[PDB]
Design a protein around this ligand. Structure first.
Ligand SMILES: Nc1ncnc2c1ncn2[C@@H]1O[C@@H]2COP(=O)(O)O[C@H]3[C@@H](O)[C@H](n4cnc5c(N)ncnc54)O[C@@H]3COP(=O)(O)O[C@H]2[C@H]1O
Ligand SMILES: [Cl-]
Ligand SMILES: [Cl-]
Ligand SMILES: [Cl-]
Lengths: 349, 312, 349
């Protein structure tokens, strides 16, 4: 049966239902709509008219001009009853206010289908699904909230870029420390989490969120790959981390609380380094995945072969073109390409 | 328990409740008021707040601005709860329309107390008492309707007086046709029936009916005695009817339909219903002339009517 | 008693009260609410009914449909009276218009508790707190005002950083003038004051200000420390400023009007220098507290003894390693760490 998130989706902008509800709000009639009909719904239905017509936004609006409730079919394709009096079991507990809304939630609990109440006085839509409630929000308000989050995401993306460049400078110089790696890990997670918040707003916006989706995907583009690469470079396991190991590490990062993200030792635990403050100053050596990703045109398949062969970024910098053409799967052309691409990083920083 | 009529009296003009209801109608807020509180009412009361204030029309109006129902104490002197949600058993049958009113009658049946709903859309007050319902009518409408009826009542009384003396003249002649008696009987019944219609309006008017109460009693008064005398004078049984016989006959006429009020009349009086029977001349007994019982049994007829009347 | 700012937070978005007030506005009934109840409130309360219910936004809306005023408990957790007639002392001064609002401000002054009046005609919420007034504003309008203010703050942050770099470069060169120091002082103050304006908007926005708070914290952060150090470095009194004296100077800066902050002579007076034109041209020498604060893990006790011995940053730079071990209370290891850090100032530029 419909879940709370699924029901909100059925009422998202661009849907036939949401069009009808918008019409009801402008009409200021109020409404009480049951999204489903079975034996249990009929049990609580009293009086009213039985009708069999196709759903239409306009048809719903007119029917809700009448006292009572409108029942739709489970698939949502039809309007099955109108002018109904709901009589849910009064023992079902609810903290809502007034006959309409208390009747709505009780009916939602008893039948198991979503129930919608529209307040004529407040012009507010509430949907009740099995003890949970959600109040719809105008697309403008959601956009305002999401654009504030987009602004913060713009600030976190700039901050991530600068610390990442600092880490890249340290990797070339061979003066990286756990603290340097974990500063980037934190900034990667902050970008990810604020991105998840904006994503929920995109879902709630429905068709009104299409542009916000494009902007969000552009800003978040490459964040997943950066999280993978940093795990691949600085994971306490001696051998290069396994693919499942990488997925395990990222899952632990998501499991961290927001407060834990502000703890560099909490992040160090996830990567497998000691949790002591002293451990933050210990020197690390990158494997070279991040640097290789910065080389233009270099497919990750080839970089994985080189990183496993030489072990460390410093080994790759010291390697000759002939040293980089002795790895199976690395041709002469790619050995030259990586050789000049690495020596360009050495000079630049 | 209070009866439907008793409840309507509690809501009549001149009462504190009716002052409150009139204010609610002008406010167009709608209302749902329970006239009584006990465990059974509380059982169906859900949410809301408890308060203990003296009843006042102004206080009732303010509290009914809120969603929900207001409960008063049984004596009606206090307001005990407001903003409550009534939750009567949906199995209780009702043919009312909408959440507010169906809940009102069900609550009235379940608790046994009067329940009032005021519709904001229709500005109509309905009172429910144990499966019965009454709709209040504006005192202005009742007054205007009742005054048209009182105007008719004087006309029925004048037309009754004119025909009654015609019958009395025939009594002198001894040639009173059966149709003549039933013409007077018809006018007596018509006066009685309009009198009952007006009486119901006077009660609903409360204090606004005080003047119509006096006017009604003057026109009617003497109607019961007149109906008793005419049955006592022109009853089929040659024996003078007993007091129980007279009251039984008067009840029989009341059972007649509006349209029937001459052949239908003759049969209740015991005369044959045939249209030929309505043509049969009758002889008055004389009770009416004396009013203008022991003596009449001696003489038998008005035609018989000093020592002979000091012999019985 | 609660202050005006405290009341504004209590009526901000995300609070139970604000949910009720939003409901009242949509109903267009108007309201008169007392945020507190004691014997003094009872004195001015007349008639009405006593109720004891838990506070709820929906309950408040229904009670404010009634003529009169609603009284809440001091903690705000309960609704104790409704339909009350306030009868505050007419002699209490007020500039509000009409019975409702004049009664509201007078009641606020007499009892000492916040009082809210909502105008049905104007759809405006007003809160009165002991002779002050605050009118609630749409969260959209506040956000628009605050985001522009954030834009100005980012520009103030950029100019602050560059003038700060100029001042530090001059400190090494020994060519700092009083005007240059006041250019940095002006920019630090401008950043601080626009920061306070945005802070008030964040409070008023409540839950709608969460993202704005994050942006504000990054832009400002470090502003207090920079103001403290600059006063510590360039204050006219020969004795190094005490911590309390520094706070006194900073309090004098806050007392200046927005117009005064554009006047370099007014700032010069706050630091004890003369207001003359000639004073602006005179060359100063930093005390060196800022440089010591940049040295990692150098407790201010070791910085105050060194600054008191040599007096100026140029004296600290001119000192030898042995000269930094002949100060009482400074160790040999600490003398090495301080000397190396000042040499890193040469690395800076
Ligand atoms: N049993 C009861 N106890 C206490 N107060 C009662 C009540 N029944 C009705 N009321 C009051 O009367 C208002 C108008 O009722 P009405 O049935 O015209 O107007 C109703 C009806 O058209 C519909 N509605 C409410 N509950 C319903 C239910 N269980 N089934 C179907 N329709 C319902 O929503 C309208 C507005 O509901 P809302 O509560 O805002 O407004 C209600 C409520 O404040
Ligand atoms: Cl609601
Ligand atoms: Cl119900
Ligand atoms: Cl709301």
């Amino acid at each position: 049966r419909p879940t709370l998130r699924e029901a909100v989706a059925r009422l998202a902008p661009g849907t036939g239902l949401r069009d009808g509800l918008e019409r009801i709000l402008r009409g200021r009639t109020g409404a009480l709509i049951v999204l489903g009909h079975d034996e249990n719904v009929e049990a609580i239905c009293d009086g009213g008219f039985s009708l069999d017509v196709r759903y239409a936004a306009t048809r719903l609006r007119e029917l809700c001009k009448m006292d009572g409730a409108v029942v739709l079919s489970t698939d949502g394709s039809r309007i099955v009853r109108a002018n109904v009096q709901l009589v849910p079991d009064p023992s079902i507990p609810t903290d809502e206010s007034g006959t309409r809304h208390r009747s709505a939630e009780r009916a939602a609990i008893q039948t198991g289908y979503p129930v919608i109440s529209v307040s004529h006085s407040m012009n507010i839509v509430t949907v009740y699904v099995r003890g949970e409630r959600h109040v719809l929000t105008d697309s403008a308000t959601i956009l305002s909230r999401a654009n504030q989050a987009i602004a913060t995401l713009e600030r976190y993306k700039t901050r991530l870029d600068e610390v990442s460049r600092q880490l890249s400078r340290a990797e070339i110089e061979d003066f990286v420390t756990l603290r340097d790696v974990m500063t980037v890990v934190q900034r990667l997670e902050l970008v990810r989490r604020i991105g998840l918040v904006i994503d929920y707003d995109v879902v709630e916006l429905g068709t009104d969120g299409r542009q916000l989706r494009l902007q969000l995907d552009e800003l978040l583009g490459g964040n997943d790959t950066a999280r993978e690469l940093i795990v691949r470079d600085y994971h306490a396991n001696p051998e290069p981390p396994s693919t499942g190991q990488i997925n395990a590490t990222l899952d632990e990062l998501d499991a961290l609380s927001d407060g834990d993200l502000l703890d560099f030792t909490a992040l160090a635990k996830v990567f497998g380094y000691p949790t002591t403050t002293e451990a933050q100053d210990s020197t690390l050596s990158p494997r070279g995945y991040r640097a290789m990703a910065g080389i233009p045109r270099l497919q990750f398949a080839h970089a994985d072969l080189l990183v496993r062969a030489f072990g460390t970024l410093q080994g790759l910098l010291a390697a000759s073109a002939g040293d980089l053409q002795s790895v199976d799967g690395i041709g002469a052309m790619w050995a030259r390409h990586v050789r000049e691409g690495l020596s360009q990083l050495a000079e630049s920083t």
